[PDB]
């Protein structure tokens, strides 16, 4: 079987915080 | 490992010390000391290094 991953696997790359920004 | 060898092939113990700078809380840390916090004026801070 297979099935389409939408839009997971996202995860904080780092351990820092950070707030209302566009990160590459 | 034999006493007369020569001391290139004498016996030599090795300890490696490996640790991650600042990212995230931290656990080891130095002997410095701590002190109060003050608020709303311009101080020097220094948080976890």
Same mark, same amino acid.
């Given at each position: 079987? /297979?099935?389409?991953? *939408?839009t997971?696997?996202?995860y /904080?790359?780092?351990?820092? *915080?950070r707030?209302s920004?566009?990160?590459? | 490992?034999?006493? =007369? !060898?020569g001391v290139? &092939?004498?016996p &030599?113990?090795?300890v ?10 931290? =656990?080891?840390c130095?002997? #410095? #000391?701590? =002190?109060?916090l003050? #608020?709303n #004026?311009?101080?020097?801070? !220094?948080?976890?290094?």
């Amino acid at each position: 079987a /297979y099935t389409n991953s *939408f839009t997971r696997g996202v995860y /904080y790359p780092d351990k820092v *915080f950070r707030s209302s920004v566009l990160h590459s | 490992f034999q006493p =007369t !060898n020569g001391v290139g &092939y004498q016996p &030599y113990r090795v300890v490696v010390l490996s640790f991650e700078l600042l990212h995230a809380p931290a =656990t080891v840390c130095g002997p #410095k #000391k701590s =002190t109060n916090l003050v #608020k709303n #004026k311009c101080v020097n801070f !220094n948080f976890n290094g």
